[PDB]
Amino acid sequence: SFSGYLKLTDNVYIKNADIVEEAKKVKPTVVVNAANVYLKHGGGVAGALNKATNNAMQVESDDYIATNGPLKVGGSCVLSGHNLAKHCLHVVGPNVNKGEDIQLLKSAYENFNQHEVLLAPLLSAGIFGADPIHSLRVCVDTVRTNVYLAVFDKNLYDKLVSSFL
Ligand SMILES: CCCC(=O)NCc1nc2ccccc2[nH]1
């Protein structure tokens, strides 16, 4: 199962890890992607997860959007986890860099409650522009299921742990 995680709360765990490397090692039931509404996995966590699937995630995602249209900001969809996980839960956190409502971050984290255990990044962090300290706070105050957070950046991981209330 998951190893080397620091326990933050009853159900939230954290580790300084590359989520792609973590997914390839654990092969969890669910890996969360930091998706956008179009499921265009160009960069950040999404670009990295998609590249690890040899673009199979993007081919599947394009078929999903052709059938269903875009997701909502704060919404999600369950697709294949390919070589990374049984499933990928594509969750759209608000992109502050595109002027989206930060208040939608709680709605985005609520999607995690439909899964007993997840490997996930901090939603709306990184290239999505939100404060990762705030994202972690919303995560611990919203997610009730078991969430294993992978934080790519060591310096950010240390800041998140050392500032955790
Ligand atoms: C082959 C190793 C995996 C890989 O593609 N690393 C690049 C990378 N990992 C990230 C994690 C979070 C956000 C952006 C990331 N970019």
UniProtKB/Swiss-Prot annotation:
Q: Which residues form the Macro domain?
A: 1-165
Q: How does it sit in the membrane?
A: Multi-pass membrane protein
The record lists the catalysed reaction(s) as:
Thiol-dependent hydrolysis of ester, thioester, amide, peptide and isopeptide bonds formed by the C-terminal Gly of ubiquitin (a 76-residue protein attached to proteins as an intracellular targeting signal)
Where located?
A: Host endoplasmic reticulum membrane
Regarding activators and inhibitors, the annotation says:
Inhibited in vitro by GRL-0617.
Functional note: Responsible for the cleavages located at the N-terminus of the replicase polyprotein. Participates together with nsp4 in the assembly of virally-induced cytoplasmic double-membrane vesicles necessary for viral replication. Antagonizes innate immune induction of type I interferon by blocking the phosphorylation, dimerization and subsequent nuclear translocation of host IRF3. Also prevents host NF-kappa-B signaling. In addition, PL-PRO possesses a deubiquitinating/deISGylating activity and processes both 'Lys-48'- and 'Lys-63'-linked polyubiquitin chains from cellular substrates.
Q: Which proteins does it associate with, and in what oligomeric form? A: May form homohexamers. Interacts with N protein.
- Report the protein name in the record: Papain-like protease nsp3
Q: Which organism is it from?
A: Severe acute respiratory syndrome coronavirus 2
Name of the coding gene? rep
- Shown part of the complete sequence: 1027 to 1191 of 7096
